[PDB]
Design a protein around this ligand. Structure first.
Ligand SMILES: CC(C)CNC(=O)[C@H](Nc1ccc2c(c1)CNC2)c1cc(Cl)cc2[nH]ncc12
Lengths: 156, 39
């Protein structure tokens, strides 16, 4: 059905009314989202059906119709934008300078922005409009604020 | 059963709301894809 490049809402009618569980990126005929959003379950695009192709619970990522296509990376210096798609609200770009998640396996960028759970999977963009990761998997610090990682998959 | 609805183009918008800090945090990623604060 709808294979157009762009950002999409992931919705369900299982709960009350229509509830938004997450967000995703459609690019090069592939739908990219966070694993915890869909749990690897199939998706519907009109009468079209999207089946999972690749997924990893540790990375918290999943691609539909084909392999992971996003590969741009945060340069560690520049400001980025979170293209946030909140439940029931219009897509909105928020510019921020990312922080750092120091792990034993290397440093990853971090975005300290607060959005409801249904915003999980919103893309993070560089100054060219290339998706450098997905927002929606992170931690909660001392002041109750949420810090998400900049999650990027590996392109083959 | 889940479904997708388009929400917009993927573009950088000049002059957008600039907010949020840049913290440097020590974190740990478990086998279940869960991050946690290391102190
Ligand atoms: C806040 C921490 C403790 C949870 N981390 C999140 O990123 C969370 N989603 C989530 C849920 C289950 C799993 C994972 C991630 C990874 N694999 C299991 C989330 C994301 C946003 Cl954007 C808002 C949220 N509100 N509450 C939760 C929440």
């Amino acid at each position: 059905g709808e294979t157009t490049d762009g950002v999409y809402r992931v919705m369900t009618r299982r709960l009350l009314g229509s509830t938004q569980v997450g967000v995703g990126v459609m690019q090069e005929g592939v739908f990219h989202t966070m694993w915890h959003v869909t749990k690897g379950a199939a998706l519907r695009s009109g009468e079209g059906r999207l089946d999972p192709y690749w997924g990893d619970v540790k990375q918290d990522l999943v691609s539909y119709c084909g392999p992971w296509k996003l590969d741009a990376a945060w340069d560690g210096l520049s400001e980025v934008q979170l293209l946030a798609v909140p439940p029931g609200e219009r897509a909105k770009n928020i510019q921020t300078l990312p922080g750092i998640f120091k792990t034993k396996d290397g440093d990853i960028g971090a975005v300290a922005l607060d959005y409801p759970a249904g915003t999980s999977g919103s893309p993070i963009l560089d100054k060219c409009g290339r998706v450098i990761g997905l927002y929606g998997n992170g931690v909660v610090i001392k002041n109750g604020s949420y810090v998400s990682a900049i999650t990027q998959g590996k392109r083959e | 059963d889940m479904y997708i609805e388009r929400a917009g183009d993927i573009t950088w918008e000049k002059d957008a709301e600039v907010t949020g800090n840049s913290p440097r945090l020590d974190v740990a990623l478990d086998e279940s894809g869960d991050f946690s604060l290391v102190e």
